[PDB]
Enzyme design. Structure first.
Site, PDB file in Angstrom:
ATOM      1  N   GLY A  91      71.125  14.634  14.767  1.00 28.80           N
ATOM      2  CA  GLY A  91      69.875  15.090  14.208  1.00 28.80           C
ATOM      3  C   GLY A  91      69.105  16.160  14.988  1.00 28.80           C
ATOM      4  N   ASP A 145      58.940  15.988  11.308  1.00 29.96           N
ATOM      5  CA  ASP A 145      58.740  17.411  11.654  1.00 29.96           C
ATOM      6  C   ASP A 145      58.546  18.240  10.398  1.00 29.96           C
ATOM      7  OD1 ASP A 145      59.059  16.745  14.355  1.00 29.96           O
ATOM      8  OD2 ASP A 145      60.863  17.958  14.692  1.00 29.96           O
ATOM      9  N   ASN A 168      65.911  10.238  21.923  1.00 27.59           N
ATOM     10  CA  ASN A 168      66.118  11.651  22.052  1.00 27.59           C
ATOM     11  C   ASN A 168      66.621  12.036  23.430  1.00 27.59           C
ATOM     12  OD1 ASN A 168      65.592  13.000  19.663  1.00 27.59           O
ATOM     13  ND2 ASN A 168      63.385  12.495  19.884  1.00 27.59           N
ATOM     14  N   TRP A 224      65.505   5.739  17.570  1.00 30.74           N
ATOM     15  CA  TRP A 224      66.076   7.097  17.650  1.00 30.74           C
ATOM     16  C   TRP A 224      65.754   7.602  19.107  1.00 30.74           C
ATOM     17  CZ3 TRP A 224      66.134  10.903  13.001  1.00 30.74           C
ATOM     18  CH2 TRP A 224      66.419  12.236  13.438  1.00 30.74           C
ATOM     19  N   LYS A 237      69.602  19.225  11.242  1.00 33.16           N
ATOM     20  CA  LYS A 237      68.449  20.052  10.888  1.00 33.16           C
ATOM     21  C   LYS A 237      68.768  21.367  10.146  1.00 33.16           C
ATOM     22  CE  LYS A 237      64.680  17.885  12.126  1.00 33.16           C
ATOM     23  NZ  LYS A 237      64.088  17.191  10.986  1.00 33.16           N
TER      24      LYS A 237
END
Ligand SMILES: OCC1=N[C@H]2[C@@H](O1)O[C@H](CO)[C@@H](O)[C@@H]2O
Ligand SMILES: [Ca+2]
Length: 576
Positions: free
Chosen positions: A124, A232, A328, A326, A155
């Site tokens: 992602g 986002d 990162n 999630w 993305k």
């Protein structure tokens, strides 16, 4: 060594030979993907099956009563590979293959099962999506490490986001996704197909139906798990009310209507503590309206952060379910000039019960992400026994057996992110760090430098060099080497600069000048690589060893050149 390490392991200091002649019980009834691997791996009875199968009736009480659990036994007379379900039997055999060494096995008994329900990777990040071959190879990897989730959500894929999320994939891409789904199934991984509609979604029946028809088309390709991402975005797609409506609608008319749908997952617009409003409603709405079975994704306190007890109790309390994490890291889409090749750490090992899944957002360099992904797989399956450093080394040795020390040397000094907008940092180079701190200390105030520190700095540089040259030529994993090559060059140069800066610290005037000119030429080769490799719009270039090694060299250079400029009255340039 077993990765991930089982929940229960008893070992007899005996060792059985892999059976020259054997008898297979259950080949026709146990998980065919499990049976394939076993047949691949090769009188004495071997029993394979899932609980409820005839072949394993005798061990049915040994088999853990957990989703994906299994029982494994080896001794003189028989072998048992018995899952609680089919994925369990597959996992039983992933453990089996790690025991078989030189056609020999230790005598053991194992009861095993995962502490976190969903474990895997979310593709992602921002940037160039993994290639097709990179994805095939990831999926075999996940299966070996008992990762059961792959969330496809690049993305920059236009059939996943605005505005072509409404369109069926064209034929080439569709046949490819179809192959990804198949390889996922064979490796026991849920392929979760994510869609990201919120940037341009209209909250009308027209868009709601095109979303459903998108899902329906994916289902025809073989997809059995889904997600809808709201991260986002700005605009009307941020409305929490509308989001949960849309997710429940998909639940009620799709996941609940098809026979065989597994995960249904949403990613919230407010996805870390720091960005959630204390007085606004976003997260309590979602917690209150979303059907209980729908997962909610969460990144922690901030966009990039480690998962703590305080952090996860905080979120679990507002979304009225356990957060689907999630994480990162090792994602580097906001520090695109660094590689993040260090250990996975900082995540609380006591909170397995407080999460429904744990996924890692990796780098755009697929193969180099394998170090962290192996580790995240080891952590999510057995957090209680999670060993940072040992897992990191196991990863490297699994990923590049033929040059594992060299890969460790390189990754050890490629860990930190350098300063960034999210304030997130990793340790780097702590091995040579004490010696570097002392040796530097000595100079900037005036006192002597220790001979031991100096020899170590010089031993570091020399080892960096062998490792760089060995890695560049390694053909065992070419794809990994293509990814890291620009950094391998920068790393070699950094070490050559360091050897030349040290030689300046040891003689006569024209030697110092030769070395000083050599250094300036090395600086420029680095600038060159920095200006022409990995030229992306955002953080162009290639930085390496930046936490401790680079600043050490830049400063030992400025200082020896200062000494000189006054002990000989010269005007040498001292910048870097
Ligand atoms: O949904 C979680 C999330 N969405 C964004 C955000 O975190 O930051 C990541 C790193 O910059 C980026 O890769 C990701 O696409
Ligand atoms: Ca069966």
């Amino acid at each position: 060594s077993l990765q991930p390490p089982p929940q229960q392991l008893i070992v007899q200091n005996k060792t059985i030979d892999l059976p020259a002649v054997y008898q297979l019980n259950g080949g026709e009834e146990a998980n065919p993907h499990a049976v394939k691997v076993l047949k691949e791996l090769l009188g004495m009875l071997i029993s394979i099956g899932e609980k409820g199968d005839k072949s394993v009736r005798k061990y049915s009480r040994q088999i853990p009563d957990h989703k994906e659990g299994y029982y494994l036994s080896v001794n003189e007379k028989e072998i048992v590979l018995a899952g609680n379900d089919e994925r369990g039997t597959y996992y039983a055999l992933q453990t089996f293959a790690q025991l078989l060494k030189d056609g020999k096995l230790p005598e053991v008994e194992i009861k095993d099962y995962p502490s976190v329900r969903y474990r895997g990777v979310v593709e992602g990040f921002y940037g160039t999506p993994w290639s097709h071959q990179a994805r095939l190879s990831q999926l075999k990897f996940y299966g070996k490490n008992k990762m059961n989730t792959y969330i496809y959500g690049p993305k920059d894929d236009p059939y996943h986001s605005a505005p072509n999320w409404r369109l069926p994939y064209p034929d080439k891409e569709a046949a490819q996704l179809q192959e990804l789904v198949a390889v996922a199934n064979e490796n026991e991984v849920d392929f979760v197909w994510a869609i990201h509609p919120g940037q341009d979604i209209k909250w009308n029946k027209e868009d709601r139906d095109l979303l459903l028809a998108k899902f329906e088309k994916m289902y025809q390709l073989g997809v059995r798990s889904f997600a809808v991402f709201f991260n986002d975005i700005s605009g009307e797609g941020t409305n929490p009310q509308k989001q949960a409506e849309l997710l429940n609608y998909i639940d009620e008319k799709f996941a609940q209507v098809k026979p065989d749908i597994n995960q249904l997952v949403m990613c919230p617009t407010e996805y870390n503590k720091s960005w959630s409003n204390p007085n606004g409603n976003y997260l309590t709405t979602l917690g209150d309206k979303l059907n209980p079975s729908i997962q909610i994704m969460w990144t922690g306190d901030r966009v990039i952060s480690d998962i703590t007890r305080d952090g996860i109790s905080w979120i679990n309390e507002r979304i009225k379910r356990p957060a689907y994490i999630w994480w990162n890291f090792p994602v580097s889409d906001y520090v695109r000039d660094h590689l993040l090749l260090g250990p996975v750490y900082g995540n609380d090992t006591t909170i397995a019960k407080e999460m429904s899944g744990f996924v890692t957002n990796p780098m755009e360099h697929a193969e180099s992400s394998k170090i962290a992904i192996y580790s995240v797989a080891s952590y999510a399956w057995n957090p209680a026994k999670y060993d940072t450093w040992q897992t990191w080394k196991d990863a490297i040795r699994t990923i590049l057996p033929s040059a594992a020390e060299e890969l460790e040397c390189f990754a050890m000094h490629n860990s930190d992110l350098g300063p960034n907008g999210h304030g997130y940092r990793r340790e780097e180079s702590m091995d040579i760090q004490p010696a570097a701190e002392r040796f530097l200390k000595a100079f900037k105030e005036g006192k002597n430098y220790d001979k031991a520190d100096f020899e170590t700095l010089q031993y570091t540089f020399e080892r960096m060099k062998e490792s760089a040259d060995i890695l560049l030529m390694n053909t065992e994993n070419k794809p990994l080497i293509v990814e890291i090559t620009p950094w391998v060059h920068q790393f070699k140069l950094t070490a050559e600069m360091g050897e030349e800066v040290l030689k300046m610290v040891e003689r006569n005037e024209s030697y110092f000048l030769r070395k000083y000119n050599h250094v300036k030429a090395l600086q420029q080769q680095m600038f060159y690589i920095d200006q022409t490799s990995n030229q992306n719009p955002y953080q162009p270039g290639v930085k390496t060893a930046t936490r401790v090694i680079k600043p050490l060299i830049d400063r030992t250079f400025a200082t020896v050149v200062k000494f000189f400029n006054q002990k000989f009255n010269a005007h040498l340039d001292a910048t870097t």
